[PDB]
Amino acid sequence: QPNTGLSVGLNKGHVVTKKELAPRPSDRKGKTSKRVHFVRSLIREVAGFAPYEKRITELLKVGKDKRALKVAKRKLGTHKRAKKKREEMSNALRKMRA
Amino acid sequence: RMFAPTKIWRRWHRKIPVNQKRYAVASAIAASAVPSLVLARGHRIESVPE
Amino acid sequence: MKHNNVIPNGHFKKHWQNYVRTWFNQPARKTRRRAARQQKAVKIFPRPTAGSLRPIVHGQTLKYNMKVRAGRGFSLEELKAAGIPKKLAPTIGIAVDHRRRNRSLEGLQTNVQRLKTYKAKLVIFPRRAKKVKAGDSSAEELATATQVQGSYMPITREQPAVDLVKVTDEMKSFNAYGKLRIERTNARHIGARLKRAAEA
Amino acid sequence: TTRFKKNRKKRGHVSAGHGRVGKHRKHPGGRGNAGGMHHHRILFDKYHPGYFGKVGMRYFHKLRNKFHCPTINIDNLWSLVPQEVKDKAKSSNATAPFIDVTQYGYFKVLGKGVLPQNQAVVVKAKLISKNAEKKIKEAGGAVVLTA
RNA sequence: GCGACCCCAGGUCAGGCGGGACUACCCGCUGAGUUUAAGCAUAUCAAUAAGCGGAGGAAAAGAAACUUACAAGGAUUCCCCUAGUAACGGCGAGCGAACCGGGAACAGCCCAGCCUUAGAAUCGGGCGGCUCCGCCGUUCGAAUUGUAGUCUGGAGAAGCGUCCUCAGCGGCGGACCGGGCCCAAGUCCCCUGGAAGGGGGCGCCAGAGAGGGUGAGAGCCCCGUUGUGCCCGGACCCUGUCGCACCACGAGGCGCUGUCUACGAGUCGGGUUGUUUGGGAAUGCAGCCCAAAUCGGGCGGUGAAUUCCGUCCAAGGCUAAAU
RNA sequence: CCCGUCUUGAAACACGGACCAAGGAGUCUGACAUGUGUGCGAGUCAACGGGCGAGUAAACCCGUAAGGCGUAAGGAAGCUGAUUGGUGGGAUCCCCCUGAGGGGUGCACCGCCGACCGACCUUGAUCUUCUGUGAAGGGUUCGAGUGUGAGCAUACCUGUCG
RNA sequence: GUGAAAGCGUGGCCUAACGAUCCUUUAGACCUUCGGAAUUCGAAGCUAGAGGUGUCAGAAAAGUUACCACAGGGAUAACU
Numbered sequence A: 001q002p003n004t005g006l007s008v009g010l011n012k013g014h015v016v017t018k019k020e021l022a023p024r025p026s027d028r029k030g031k032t033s034k035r036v037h038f039v040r041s042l043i044r045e046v047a048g049f050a051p052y053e054k055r056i057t058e059l060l061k062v063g064k065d066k067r068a069l070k071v072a073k074r075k076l077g078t079h080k081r082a083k084k085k086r087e088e089m090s091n092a093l094r095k096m097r098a
Numbered sequence B: 001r002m003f004a005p006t007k008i009w010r011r012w013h014r015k016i017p018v019n020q021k022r023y024a025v026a027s028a029i030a031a032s033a034v035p036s037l038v039l040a041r042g043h044r045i046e047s048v049p050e
Numbered sequence C: 001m002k003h004n005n006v007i008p009n010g011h012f013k014k015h016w017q018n019y020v021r022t023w024f025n026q027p028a029r030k031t032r033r034r035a036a037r038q039q040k041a042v043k044i045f046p047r048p049t050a051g052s053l054r055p056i057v058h059g060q061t062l063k064y065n066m067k068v069r070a071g072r073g074f075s076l077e078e079l080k081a082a083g084i085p086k087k088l089a090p091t092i093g094i095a096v097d098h099r100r101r102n103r104s105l106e107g108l109q110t111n112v113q114r115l116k117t118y119k120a121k122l123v124i125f126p127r128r129a130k131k132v133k134a135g136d137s138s139a140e141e142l143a144t145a146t147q148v149q150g151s152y153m154p155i156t157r158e159q160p161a162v163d164l165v166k167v168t169d170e171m172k173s174f175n176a177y178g179k180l181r182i183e184r185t186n187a188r189h190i191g192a193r194l195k196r197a198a199e200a
Numbered sequence D: 001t002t003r004f005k006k007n008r009k010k011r012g013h014v015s016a017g018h019g020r021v022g023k024h025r026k027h028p029g030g031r032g033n034a035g036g037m038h039h040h041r042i043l044f045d046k047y048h049p050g051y052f053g054k055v056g057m058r059y060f061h062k063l064r065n066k067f068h069c070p071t072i073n074i075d076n077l078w079s080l081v082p083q084e085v086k087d088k089a090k091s092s093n094a095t096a097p098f099i100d101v102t103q104y105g106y107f108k109v110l111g112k113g114v115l116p117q118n119q120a121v122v123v124k125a126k127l128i129s130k131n132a133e134k135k136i137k138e139a140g141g142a143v144v145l146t147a
Numbered sequence E: 001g002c003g004a005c006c007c008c009a010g011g012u013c014a015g016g017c018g019g020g021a022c023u024a025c026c027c028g029c030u031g032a033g034u035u036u037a038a039g040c041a042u043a044u045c046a047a048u049a050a051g052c053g054g055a056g057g058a059a060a061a062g063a064a065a066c067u068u069a070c071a072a073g074g075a076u077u078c079c080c081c082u083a084g085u086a087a088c089g090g091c092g093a094g095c096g097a098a099c100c101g102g103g104a105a106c107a108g109c110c111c112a113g114c115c116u117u118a119g120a121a122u123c124g125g126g127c128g129g130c131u132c133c134g135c136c137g138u139u140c141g142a143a144u145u146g147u148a149g150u151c152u153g154g155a156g157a158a159g160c161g162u163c164c165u166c167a168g169c170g171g172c173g174g175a176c177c178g179g180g181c182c183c184a185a186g187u188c189c190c191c192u193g194g195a196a197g198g199g200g201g202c203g204c205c206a207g208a209g210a211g212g213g214u215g216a217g218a219g220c221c222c223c224g225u226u227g228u229g230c231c232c233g234g235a236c237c238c239u240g241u242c243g244c245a246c247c248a249c250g251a252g253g254c255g256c257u258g259u260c261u262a263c264g265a266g267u268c269g270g271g272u273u274g275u276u277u278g279g280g281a282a283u284g285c286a287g288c289c290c291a292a293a294u295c296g297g298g299c300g301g302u303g304a305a306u307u308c309c310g311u312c313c314a315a316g317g318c319u320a321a322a323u
Numbered sequence F: 001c002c003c004g005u006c007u008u009g010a011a012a013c014a015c016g017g018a019c020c021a022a023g024g025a026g027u028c029u030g031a032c033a034u035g036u037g038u039g040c041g042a043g044u045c046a047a048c049g050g051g052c053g054a055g056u057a058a059a060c061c062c063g064u065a066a067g068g069c070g071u072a073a074g075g076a077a078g079c080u081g082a083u084u085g086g087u088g089g090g091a092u093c094c095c096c097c098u099g100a101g102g103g104g105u106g107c108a109c110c111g112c113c114g115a116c117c118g119a120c121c122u123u124g125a126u127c128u129u130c131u132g133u134g135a136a137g138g139g140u141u142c143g144a145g146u147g148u149g150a151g152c153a154u155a156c157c158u159g160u161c162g
Numbered sequence G: 001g002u003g004a005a006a007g008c009g010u011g012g013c014c015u016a017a018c019g020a021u022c023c024u025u026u027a028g029a030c031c032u033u034c035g036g037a038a039u040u041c042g043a044a045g046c047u048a049g050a051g052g053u054g055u056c057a058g059a060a061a062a063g064u065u066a067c068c069a070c071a072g073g074g075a076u077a078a079c080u
């Protein structure tokens, strides 16, 4: 949204024609190649899951999603990473079910 | 050891306002035009034309 | 302690006498820097002594956003718009900054115009005397080539001017204080209004 | 200047002006601000009220640039106008001088004092006080908001 | 029993490397108390002294997992200001940064990973040559548990166009530095003095009247000083010019793309303990426990959940100048 | 009565002093404060740095929207932000008359009381983006405020403090 | 509140009967802030009390020394 030209209120500031930032290679920092995804999947198949990952999967199988999230948080350290790990375990469980 | 040994960080220098410096310079220049003051300062100007 | 004096807070409880820095070498430092500048100018002759061209950038924060100063180097987008390859810009006296982002047109256009002016004012000697390439200058231009001592492109502000204008009824019937107060109130209550709208 | 120091006048007077009885000892009452509450309490209370205690909230990592807000008064607005602009405005009553106080470095306009008599003024600023805006309107000018 | 590999052992084997010394500055560790608080224990002294190590001519830092919230800046370092400020503190004594802004100087880069497989294109040693800080030939060895080449996020790979850019040698000077040789003028007359270099008189040089010596205050006695001239040697770096061949396979630049686009792990992060910091529900560091992710991860100075937004890309490495 | 010292009190049965020469103790620095001298003045300060220049550590010059202090204050903060006075004494000057007189003038300073800005309380027509604005009207409350600026630099003595 | 009312009542007929900073905790506001923007917890602010310093203008504090030490005191004991 363009600046209103006022020094107070919403969208305040000096009026300029805003420009979209030009694309740069750093826009793909969080992405990797299909080869890397394939290698990671194969190594996951070869190496299996960690004991705490198995515990989370068992809790999810039972149906204690809150307990699974709590265990993941206590293991990893943060709520965000615990949520991501619980979601990944849930996806693995769905794939196993199908 | 001497009492209160001298140190290098004594305030050696002075920061006089530029306006006062210019005042002093103008005063000295004006005085240089007075024959009485030039003689009083010890200069032999008895033979100077003007 | 005695009498009505400001409470003292001198920070002199360590071995501060061993960390005193004096400035008796100030004239010597000035002389050394001038000598280095002269040597560099002689070495880079006939290149300008002011250094490579720099972009025009805005001051940071609300205290200085009205000021224009010199930035580190021209952005990649500015170089692309001006038609100067980024690998060639440094070799012809143009500073390059691959980090600076271009968020508004005005700055990019200003820097592109600056680069165009620099190219118009630039004379490039051929790599080999007898060979003339695309970017090289003519012999007539090369002959009258001299070193510029000062800043060839000063970054100056547009001096303020007071103009006489007609005061219309629209301007006379504007409540600046009321506008400011209502904008402040809206900014303060935006969250509550959005919450109420979402609820209903 | 050592020769003007009063200790020079006290050469040959034994106590150097610090008394035979009391004398000049090292730190008879402690160092610095010692005893602010105990034996210097009277001094601290009578000359430095408010010294002890804390009030208000803290502000971690406070930067002053976001609070920068220079102010100018309407009695000082006219001084910003150049002389040629001033007499042009005096000659012509159909137009009013247009002052951008931001270019001179002011963010807010305050309403202290008075303006030149029978002179309209168009003032552009980031902020303005209610009294200043009222005075400008009464003078017959206008206020513009900018950032 | 032989052979291949692996790990290891002995060699005064052929050829190399290391230890220790110095202290003003520099880098890492360890680490007090005197003292101040008018007592004293947290604090302060001090992230100092002492102690243990490691370099250079500078070191260290350095190319954003940054600052900010702006109309945005853009490696590192240093100066001024910010500022005795925000903050910390038996909120007592005291302590105390950072960003913006103005200056000095400025410079950017190299790797790991998918990508020769029509053959490791790479490198070390011996030997023999050459215009010998290196190049060539040959032979052994290293290396596939990966040497070369391309690529490093600012990008890049691949494909198609543009025809825009890219290839040395030698001579003579300039610039810088270190040295050598020569080059002005009174020792005129008188007096006192052991001795004139002191006094008086008469002359002279001066881009040289800085300084020193000589029998007492010496511009002109001597060395020197000022300014020319000539001569010698380093540094092979910068710079001007001249003489000759100047080859674009290939690689770069620019434009396009309905294709790809690989980025560092017991590391980040979290819990806790100790220490430190202005960093305050915890600034950094370290021990122990847990332990990640790739439409993801770190930061946004009040802990927590939800929804957005801003900004960068750590866990590999090099780098002159301002000091 | 022998000096110096501490002392209510010293010639003291109070301490130091056998004698002479030379050396021997309120200093320098940082932060403030009053006073005074000097420059400028709503400004002031070029010495971080740059340009030079006694062939030169001096002197001279340079402030772009630099910075410090001042030029606005009140609130913890969000935030708001000086409507421009009256009166009693009072110096100087001008008139009438020569009384310790009368009229005009009324700077500095002091006393008293209003008004304005802000913290707090109170108050509320009209507009308004519904939470803001503010015609009128306030207060035994609070301020290191306003009501035609007085600072900045520099020198020295003195005083507190490290 | 009381009285019909004037009036009286801001603790006890009067002269004593009590307590700072920091921290904690309670009460009050459709109050302020958590500094990229919102909501909610949490935290931090403003005003008024409470938890106490009796050495009561308010450190957090056990002895012994004949094994003893220092700066002083005739401002102060043990003779004359």
Ligand SMILES: [K+]
Binding pocket: C003, C004, C005, F033
């Ligand atoms: K005082």
Ligand SMILES: [K+]
Binding pocket: D016, D017, D018
């Ligand atoms: K005295």
Ligand SMILES: [K+]
Binding pocket: D018, D019, D020, D021, D022, D023
């Ligand atoms: K006395």
Ligand SMILES: [K+]
Binding pocket: D056, D057, D058, G044
């Ligand atoms: K607080």
Ligand SMILES: [K+]
Binding pocket: none
């Ligand atoms: K070989």
Ligand SMILES: [K+]
Binding pocket: none
């Ligand atoms: K490689």
Ligand SMILES: [K+]
Binding pocket: E152, E263
């Ligand atoms: K990569």
Ligand SMILES: [K+]
Binding pocket: none
């Ligand atoms: K990386």
Ligand SMILES: [K+]
Binding pocket: none
């Ligand atoms: K840890």
Ligand SMILES: [K+]
Binding pocket: none
């Ligand atoms: K992010």
Ligand SMILES: [K+]
Binding pocket: F005, F006
């Ligand atoms: K005595």
Ligand SMILES: [K+]
Binding pocket: none
């Ligand atoms: K005696």
Ligand SMILES: [K+]
Binding pocket: none
């Ligand atoms: K200024």
Ligand SMILES: [K+]
Binding pocket: F075, F076, F119
């Ligand atoms: K308040």
Ligand SMILES: [K+]
Binding pocket: G011
């Ligand atoms: K009563």
Ligand SMILES: [K+]
Binding pocket: G055
């Ligand atoms: K007491």
